[PDB]
Amino acid sequence: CFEADIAIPSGISRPDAAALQRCEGRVVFLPTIRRQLALADVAHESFVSGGVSPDTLGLLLAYRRRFPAVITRVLPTRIVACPVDLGLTHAGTVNLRNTSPVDLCNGDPVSLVPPVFEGQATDVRLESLDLTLRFPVPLPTPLAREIVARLVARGIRDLNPRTPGELPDLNVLYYNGARLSLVADVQQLASVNTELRSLVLNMVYSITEGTTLILTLIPRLLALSAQDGYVNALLQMQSVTREAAQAPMLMQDGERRLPLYEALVAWLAHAGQLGDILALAPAVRVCTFDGAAVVQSGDMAPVIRYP
Amino acid sequence: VVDGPAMLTLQVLAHNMAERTTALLCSAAPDAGANTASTANMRIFDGAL
């Protein structure tokens, strides 16, 4: 585990000692690797920057440059945390707590998302030690990648107004059913802006010279549309692909460079990496020993290493 | 019972007339709504004079 401890610094509200008991299996973001550390850098008051608190995109950027840690065992003197970034060498598969409305799967990669849900705030309050605690919500990673694209684009609509007030909310989610509504309260600009720029600048490099030949086959896409099932379902209705349909540009130097093969490389370099440069890295994977295929809300799932 | 000045006013035959009849054949396809890949080769002929 390469054991790391966090002590109980000063005093105890006597029911709130039991509040630390039911947080077993949650995640602490501690911005270090320590053998002992105070509880002051733990809470959300440390997540608050100079003067201002981060938004749910800034908390992504706040959870960027800190280190997650697993609650292992809860003492009245200390709390032993295992440093996820290094000390994931656990054949004992140190256990986590699922605090999420989604019943997951077996075999999901699990990445951490700030509490942004309408009813799972994960707000526990300490008044003897005046601190506020937001636990991250562990979620499956495609469902995690369906969230971060919404919240930045919702902040993309925070730059430009123009349109009438009835906008698509980006606030109805879909997992097999299960209509989810999240919170849209505040959108800090710099958390939107720096997230928007890497969405711009990576999509710059992901276009290359041999990429341009693929753009010719855009009318070839709709030729498969009215003659099969798979393509017509692949072609989305709310897509620009159905909108843009309504050429080599020769410039041929040398022609032994494999121009089409080189196109799919650098496209995958930056447009292939769009979930992980915006959000947190997944290192938690669902692995139950008993053959249980799903893990209930509130359960203690065994946790294995990087996916 | 048709008298004189009725068929006397058949004088107006010089203005409009018709020469002969002609079979019109202009076929069709299935609609937007049934036109699929197998039905794209389908034609339906319609004849009329």
PDB file of C-alpha atoms in Angstrom, chain A residues 39-250:
ATOM      1  CA  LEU A  39      -6.932  17.461   7.465  1.00  0.00           C
ATOM      2  CA  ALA A  40      -6.879  21.103   6.314  1.00  0.00           C
ATOM      3  CA  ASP A  41      -5.825  20.448   2.703  1.00  0.00           C
ATOM      4  CA  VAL A  42      -8.387  17.628   2.477  1.00  0.00           C
ATOM      5  CA  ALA A  43     -11.696  19.485   2.366  1.00  0.00           C
ATOM      6  CA  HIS A  44     -13.373  21.687  -0.237  1.00  0.00           C
ATOM      7  CA  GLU A  45     -12.055  24.865   1.404  1.00  0.00           C
ATOM      8  CA  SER A  46      -8.694  23.764  -0.001  1.00  0.00           C
ATOM      9  CA  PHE A  47     -10.421  23.103  -3.336  1.00  0.00           C
ATOM     10  CA  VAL A  48     -11.531  26.749  -3.267  1.00  0.00           C
ATOM     11  CA  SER A  49      -8.782  28.814  -4.895  1.00  0.00           C
ATOM     12  CA  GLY A  50      -7.873  32.389  -4.008  1.00  0.00           C
ATOM     13  CA  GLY A  51     -11.166  34.087  -3.201  1.00  0.00           C
ATOM     14  CA  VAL A  52     -13.330  31.993  -5.560  1.00  0.00           C
ATOM     15  CA  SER A  53     -14.652  28.420  -5.590  1.00  0.00           C
ATOM     16  CA  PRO A  54     -14.214  26.292  -8.738  1.00  0.00           C
ATOM     17  CA  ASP A  55     -17.069  25.367 -11.038  1.00  0.00           C
ATOM     18  CA  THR A  56     -17.735  21.731 -11.986  1.00  0.00           C
ATOM     19  CA  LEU A  57     -15.356  22.266 -14.884  1.00  0.00           C
ATOM     20  CA  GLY A  58     -12.869  24.022 -12.618  1.00  0.00           C
ATOM     21  CA  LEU A  59     -13.145  21.178 -10.124  1.00  0.00           C
ATOM     22  CA  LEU A  60     -12.106  18.935 -13.001  1.00  0.00           C
ATOM     23  CA  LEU A  61      -9.123  21.234 -13.332  1.00  0.00           C
ATOM     24  CA  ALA A  62      -8.829  21.237  -9.546  1.00  0.00           C
ATOM     25  CA  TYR A  63      -8.942  17.434  -9.499  1.00  0.00           C
ATOM     26  CA  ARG A  64      -6.295  17.550 -12.222  1.00  0.00           C
ATOM     27  CA  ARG A  65      -3.361  18.654 -10.077  1.00  0.00           C
ATOM     28  CA  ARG A  66      -4.147  16.731  -6.891  1.00  0.00           C
ATOM     29  CA  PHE A  67      -3.841  13.056  -5.914  1.00  0.00           C
ATOM     30  CA  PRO A  68      -6.811  10.747  -5.175  1.00  0.00           C
ATOM     31  CA  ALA A  69      -6.577   8.423  -2.172  1.00  0.00           C
ATOM     32  CA  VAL A  70      -8.687   5.475  -0.979  1.00  0.00           C
ATOM     33  CA  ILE A  71     -10.070   5.321   2.548  1.00  0.00           C
ATOM     34  CA  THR A  72      -8.788   1.983   3.815  1.00  0.00           C
ATOM     35  CA  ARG A  73      -9.385   1.864   7.575  1.00  0.00           C
ATOM     36  CA  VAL A  74     -10.932   4.424   9.915  1.00  0.00           C
ATOM     37  CA  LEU A  75      -9.412   4.954  13.364  1.00  0.00           C
ATOM     38  CA  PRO A  76     -10.507   7.544  15.935  1.00  0.00           C
ATOM     39  CA  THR A  77      -6.900   8.786  15.779  1.00  0.00           C
ATOM     40  CA  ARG A  78      -6.043   8.558  12.068  1.00  0.00           C
ATOM     41  CA  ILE A  79      -7.392   7.637   8.645  1.00  0.00           C
ATOM     42  CA  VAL A  80      -5.118   5.414   6.555  1.00  0.00           C
ATOM     43  CA  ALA A  81      -5.222   6.320   2.870  1.00  0.00           C
ATOM     44  CA  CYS A  82      -3.594   4.408   0.038  1.00  0.00           C
ATOM     45  CA  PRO A  83      -1.956   6.531  -2.695  1.00  0.00           C
ATOM     46  CA  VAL A  84      -3.871   5.584  -5.910  1.00  0.00           C
ATOM     47  CA  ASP A  85      -1.213   7.120  -8.180  1.00  0.00           C
ATOM     48  CA  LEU A  86       1.512   4.807  -6.825  1.00  0.00           C
ATOM     49  CA  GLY A  87       0.235   2.323  -4.266  1.00  0.00           C
ATOM     50  CA  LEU A  88      -2.347   0.489  -6.349  1.00  0.00           C
ATOM     51  CA  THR A  89      -0.196  -2.671  -6.072  1.00  0.00           C
ATOM     52  CA  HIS A  90      -2.964  -4.574  -4.319  1.00  0.00           C
ATOM     53  CA  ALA A  91      -3.638  -8.219  -5.012  1.00  0.00           C
ATOM     54  CA  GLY A  92      -5.962  -7.807  -2.038  1.00  0.00           C
ATOM     55  CA  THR A  93      -7.788  -5.282  -4.287  1.00  0.00           C
ATOM     56  CA  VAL A  94      -8.373  -2.476  -1.760  1.00  0.00           C
ATOM     57  CA  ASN A  95     -12.043  -1.698  -1.704  1.00  0.00           C
ATOM     58  CA  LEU A  96     -14.042   1.365  -2.727  1.00  0.00           C
ATOM     59  CA  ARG A  97     -17.562   2.652  -2.104  1.00  0.00           C
ATOM     60  CA  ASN A  98     -19.891   3.271  -5.045  1.00  0.00           C
ATOM     61  CA  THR A  99     -21.850   6.459  -4.341  1.00  0.00           C
ATOM     62  CA  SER A 100     -23.749   6.837  -7.603  1.00  0.00           C
ATOM     63  CA  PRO A 101     -27.295   6.387  -8.976  1.00  0.00           C
ATOM     64  CA  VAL A 102     -26.071   4.069 -11.760  1.00  0.00           C
ATOM     65  CA  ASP A 103     -25.820   0.318 -11.212  1.00  0.00           C
ATOM     66  CA  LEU A 104     -22.631  -0.113 -13.110  1.00  0.00           C
ATOM     67  CA  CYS A 105     -21.609  -3.419 -14.854  1.00  0.00           C
ATOM     68  CA  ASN A 106     -18.798  -5.865 -14.234  1.00  0.00           C
ATOM     69  CA  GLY A 107     -15.639  -4.801 -16.028  1.00  0.00           C
ATOM     70  CA  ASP A 108     -16.186  -1.052 -16.324  1.00  0.00           C
ATOM     71  CA  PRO A 109     -13.260   1.323 -16.104  1.00  0.00           C
ATOM     72  CA  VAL A 110     -14.173   3.801 -13.371  1.00  0.00           C
ATOM     73  CA  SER A 111     -13.153   7.449 -13.428  1.00  0.00           C
ATOM     74  CA  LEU A 112     -13.970  10.081 -10.844  1.00  0.00           C
ATOM     75  CA  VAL A 113     -16.293  13.032 -11.454  1.00  0.00           C
ATOM     76  CA  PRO A 114     -17.150  15.908  -9.041  1.00  0.00           C
ATOM     77  CA  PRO A 115     -20.640  15.875  -7.507  1.00  0.00           C
ATOM     78  CA  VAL A 116     -22.801  17.566 -10.124  1.00  0.00           C
ATOM     79  CA  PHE A 117     -25.931  15.431  -9.708  1.00  0.00           C
ATOM     80  CA  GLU A 118     -29.280  16.913  -8.736  1.00  0.00           C
ATOM     81  CA  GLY A 119     -29.767  14.655  -5.728  1.00  0.00           C
ATOM     82  CA  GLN A 120     -26.453  13.012  -4.840  1.00  0.00           C
ATOM     83  CA  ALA A 121     -24.600  16.178  -3.593  1.00  0.00           C
ATOM     84  CA  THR A 122     -22.496  13.988  -1.153  1.00  0.00           C
ATOM     85  CA  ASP A 123     -22.431  16.955   1.216  1.00  0.00           C
ATOM     86  CA  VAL A 124     -21.335  16.008   4.733  1.00  0.00           C
ATOM     87  CA  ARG A 125     -20.600  18.861   7.131  1.00  0.00           C
ATOM     88  CA  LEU A 126     -18.180  19.155  10.049  1.00  0.00           C
ATOM     89  CA  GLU A 127     -18.733  22.054  12.445  1.00  0.00           C
ATOM     90  CA  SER A 128     -16.118  21.388  15.140  1.00  0.00           C
ATOM     91  CA  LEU A 129     -13.537  21.416  12.360  1.00  0.00           C
ATOM     92  CA  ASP A 130     -15.202  23.928  10.052  1.00  0.00           C
ATOM     93  CA  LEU A 131     -14.924  22.067   6.744  1.00  0.00           C
ATOM     94  CA  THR A 132     -17.126  21.116   3.786  1.00  0.00           C
ATOM     95  CA  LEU A 133     -16.741  17.773   2.035  1.00  0.00           C
ATOM     96  CA  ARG A 134     -17.625  16.955  -1.568  1.00  0.00           C
ATOM     97  CA  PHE A 135     -16.911  13.352  -2.373  1.00  0.00           C
ATOM     98  CA  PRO A 136     -16.348  12.503  -6.030  1.00  0.00           C
ATOM     99  CA  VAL A 137     -18.905  10.306  -7.756  1.00  0.00           C
ATOM    100  CA  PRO A 138     -17.348   7.147  -9.234  1.00  0.00           C
ATOM    101  CA  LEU A 139     -18.992   6.362 -12.564  1.00  0.00           C
ATOM    102  CA  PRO A 140     -18.424   4.141 -15.619  1.00  0.00           C
ATOM    103  CA  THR A 141     -16.125   5.826 -18.106  1.00  0.00           C
ATOM    104  CA  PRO A 142     -18.297   6.059 -21.293  1.00  0.00           C
ATOM    105  CA  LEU A 143     -20.997   7.539 -19.086  1.00  0.00           C
ATOM    106  CA  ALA A 144     -18.232   9.712 -17.656  1.00  0.00           C
ATOM    107  CA  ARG A 145     -17.211  10.785 -21.155  1.00  0.00           C
ATOM    108  CA  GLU A 146     -20.849  11.568 -21.944  1.00  0.00           C
ATOM    109  CA  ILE A 147     -20.915  14.124 -19.120  1.00  0.00           C
ATOM    110  CA  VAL A 148     -17.807  16.258 -19.638  1.00  0.00           C
ATOM    111  CA  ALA A 149     -18.706  17.024 -23.262  1.00  0.00           C
ATOM    112  CA  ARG A 150     -22.073  18.345 -22.071  1.00  0.00           C
ATOM    113  CA  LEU A 151     -20.767  20.645 -19.368  1.00  0.00           C
ATOM    114  CA  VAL A 152     -18.111  22.346 -21.505  1.00  0.00           C
ATOM    115  CA  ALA A 153     -20.566  22.847 -24.380  1.00  0.00           C
ATOM    116  CA  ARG A 154     -23.035  24.231 -21.864  1.00  0.00           C
ATOM    117  CA  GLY A 155     -20.255  26.672 -21.006  1.00  0.00           C
ATOM    118  CA  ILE A 156     -19.670  27.170 -24.725  1.00  0.00           C
ATOM    119  CA  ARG A 157     -23.225  28.502 -24.663  1.00  0.00           C
ATOM    120  CA  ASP A 158     -22.062  30.717 -21.784  1.00  0.00           C
ATOM    121  CA  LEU A 159     -19.915  32.711 -24.245  1.00  0.00           C
ATOM    122  CA  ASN A 160     -22.573  33.451 -26.869  1.00  0.00           C
ATOM    123  CA  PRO A 161     -26.256  34.169 -26.054  1.00  0.00           C
ATOM    124  CA  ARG A 162     -28.308  35.306 -30.296  1.00  0.00           C
ATOM    125  CA  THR A 163     -30.503  32.235 -30.050  1.00  0.00           C
ATOM    126  CA  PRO A 164     -33.923  32.311 -28.324  1.00  0.00           C
ATOM    127  CA  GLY A 165     -34.018  31.262 -24.659  1.00  0.00           C
ATOM    128  CA  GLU A 166     -35.368  27.768 -25.369  1.00  0.00           C
ATOM    129  CA  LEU A 167     -32.030  26.018 -25.779  1.00  0.00           C
ATOM    130  CA  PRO A 168     -31.438  22.256 -25.606  1.00  0.00           C
ATOM    131  CA  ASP A 169     -30.598  21.986 -21.940  1.00  0.00           C
ATOM    132  CA  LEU A 170     -27.754  19.435 -22.206  1.00  0.00           C
ATOM    133  CA  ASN A 171     -29.371  18.200 -18.996  1.00  0.00           C
ATOM    134  CA  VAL A 172     -31.123  14.923 -19.895  1.00  0.00           C
ATOM    135  CA  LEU A 173     -28.918  11.821 -19.826  1.00  0.00           C
ATOM    136  CA  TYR A 174     -29.580   8.281 -21.051  1.00  0.00           C
ATOM    137  CA  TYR A 175     -28.358   4.955 -19.652  1.00  0.00           C
ATOM    138  CA  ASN A 176     -30.760   2.184 -20.845  1.00  0.00           C
ATOM    139  CA  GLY A 177     -33.648   4.313 -19.458  1.00  0.00           C
ATOM    140  CA  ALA A 178     -32.886   6.418 -16.404  1.00  0.00           C
ATOM    141  CA  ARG A 179     -33.528  10.092 -17.186  1.00  0.00           C
ATOM    142  CA  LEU A 180     -30.856  12.081 -15.343  1.00  0.00           C
ATOM    143  CA  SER A 181     -30.948  15.837 -14.697  1.00  0.00           C
ATOM    144  CA  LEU A 182     -27.821  17.598 -13.439  1.00  0.00           C
ATOM    145  CA  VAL A 183     -27.082  21.026 -11.961  1.00  0.00           C
ATOM    146  CA  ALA A 184     -26.535  24.160 -14.079  1.00  0.00           C
ATOM    147  CA  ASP A 185     -25.884  27.007 -11.650  1.00  0.00           C
ATOM    148  CA  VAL A 186     -22.570  28.744 -12.377  1.00  0.00           C
ATOM    149  CA  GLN A 187     -20.071  28.624 -15.240  1.00  0.00           C
ATOM    150  CA  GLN A 188     -16.708  30.233 -14.476  1.00  0.00           C
ATOM    151  CA  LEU A 189     -15.103  31.474 -17.664  1.00  0.00           C
ATOM    152  CA  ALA A 190     -11.438  30.494 -17.315  1.00  0.00           C
ATOM    153  CA  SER A 191     -12.393  26.899 -16.527  1.00  0.00           C
ATOM    154  CA  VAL A 192     -14.459  26.982 -19.708  1.00  0.00           C
ATOM    155  CA  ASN A 193     -11.847  28.888 -21.730  1.00  0.00           C
ATOM    156  CA  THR A 194      -8.801  26.715 -21.033  1.00  0.00           C
ATOM    157  CA  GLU A 195     -10.943  23.627 -21.588  1.00  0.00           C
ATOM    158  CA  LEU A 196     -12.234  25.114 -24.833  1.00  0.00           C
ATOM    159  CA  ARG A 197      -8.767  25.927 -26.179  1.00  0.00           C
ATOM    160  CA  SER A 198      -7.405  22.396 -25.845  1.00  0.00           C
ATOM    161  CA  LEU A 199     -10.585  21.282 -27.597  1.00  0.00           C
ATOM    162  CA  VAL A 200      -9.605  23.709 -30.343  1.00  0.00           C
ATOM    163  CA  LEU A 201      -5.846  23.192 -30.417  1.00  0.00           C
ATOM    164  CA  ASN A 202      -5.909  19.400 -30.403  1.00  0.00           C
ATOM    165  CA  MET A 203      -8.470  19.368 -33.215  1.00  0.00           C
ATOM    166  CA  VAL A 204      -6.014  21.515 -35.173  1.00  0.00           C
ATOM    167  CA  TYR A 205      -3.210  18.930 -35.171  1.00  0.00           C
ATOM    168  CA  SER A 206      -5.619  16.045 -35.747  1.00  0.00           C
ATOM    169  CA  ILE A 207      -6.059  17.211 -39.365  1.00  0.00           C
ATOM    170  CA  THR A 208      -3.166  16.457 -41.738  1.00  0.00           C
ATOM    171  CA  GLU A 209      -2.377  16.470 -45.446  1.00  0.00           C
ATOM    172  CA  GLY A 210      -3.666  13.002 -46.333  1.00  0.00           C
ATOM    173  CA  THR A 211      -6.743  13.660 -44.176  1.00  0.00           C
ATOM    174  CA  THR A 212      -8.179  15.801 -46.984  1.00  0.00           C
ATOM    175  CA  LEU A 213      -8.779  12.857 -49.344  1.00  0.00           C
ATOM    176  CA  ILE A 214     -11.301  11.405 -46.860  1.00  0.00           C
ATOM    177  CA  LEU A 215     -13.419  14.584 -47.114  1.00  0.00           C
ATOM    178  CA  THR A 216     -14.197  13.679 -50.732  1.00  0.00           C
ATOM    179  CA  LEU A 217     -16.179  10.615 -49.626  1.00  0.00           C
ATOM    180  CA  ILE A 218     -18.801  12.632 -47.710  1.00  0.00           C
ATOM    181  CA  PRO A 219     -21.401  12.093 -50.490  1.00  0.00           C
ATOM    182  CA  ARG A 220     -20.294   8.452 -50.487  1.00  0.00           C
ATOM    183  CA  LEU A 221     -21.578   8.164 -46.899  1.00  0.00           C
ATOM    184  CA  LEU A 222     -25.214   8.824 -47.776  1.00  0.00           C
ATOM    185  CA  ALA A 223     -25.085   6.300 -50.616  1.00  0.00           C
ATOM    186  CA  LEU A 224     -24.967   3.601 -47.948  1.00  0.00           C
ATOM    187  CA  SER A 225     -27.799   5.331 -46.077  1.00  0.00           C
ATOM    188  CA  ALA A 226     -30.825   4.106 -48.012  1.00  0.00           C
ATOM    189  CA  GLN A 227     -29.560   0.560 -48.605  1.00  0.00           C
ATOM    190  CA  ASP A 228     -28.660  -0.949 -45.205  1.00  0.00           C
ATOM    191  CA  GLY A 229     -29.421  -0.810 -41.523  1.00  0.00           C
ATOM    192  CA  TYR A 230     -26.047  -0.284 -39.887  1.00  0.00           C
ATOM    193  CA  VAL A 231     -25.017   2.882 -41.720  1.00  0.00           C
ATOM    194  CA  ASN A 232     -28.417   4.583 -41.417  1.00  0.00           C
ATOM    195  CA  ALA A 233     -28.319   3.987 -37.672  1.00  0.00           C
ATOM    196  CA  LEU A 234     -24.688   5.155 -37.577  1.00  0.00           C
ATOM    197  CA  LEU A 235     -25.628   8.372 -39.397  1.00  0.00           C
ATOM    198  CA  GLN A 236     -27.139  10.582 -36.713  1.00  0.00           C
ATOM    199  CA  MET A 237     -30.144  12.783 -37.379  1.00  0.00           C
ATOM    200  CA  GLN A 238     -28.732  15.661 -35.311  1.00  0.00           C
ATOM    201  CA  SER A 239     -25.499  15.595 -37.299  1.00  0.00           C
ATOM    202  CA  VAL A 240     -23.812  18.027 -39.674  1.00  0.00           C
ATOM    203  CA  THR A 241     -23.038  15.051 -41.947  1.00  0.00           C
ATOM    204  CA  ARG A 242     -26.630  15.047 -43.212  1.00  0.00           C
ATOM    205  CA  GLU A 243     -26.446  18.844 -43.392  1.00  0.00           C
ATOM    206  CA  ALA A 244     -23.139  19.334 -45.237  1.00  0.00           C
ATOM    207  CA  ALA A 245     -24.011  17.276 -48.334  1.00  0.00           C
ATOM    208  CA  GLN A 246     -26.219  20.060 -49.710  1.00  0.00           C
ATOM    209  CA  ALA A 247     -11.469  17.404 -55.197  1.00  0.00           C
ATOM    210  CA  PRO A 248      -7.990  15.761 -54.822  1.00  0.00           C
ATOM    211  CA  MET A 249      -6.429  19.271 -55.224  1.00  0.00           C
ATOM    212  CA  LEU A 250      -3.491  17.489 -56.792  1.00  0.00           C
TER     213      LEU A 250
END
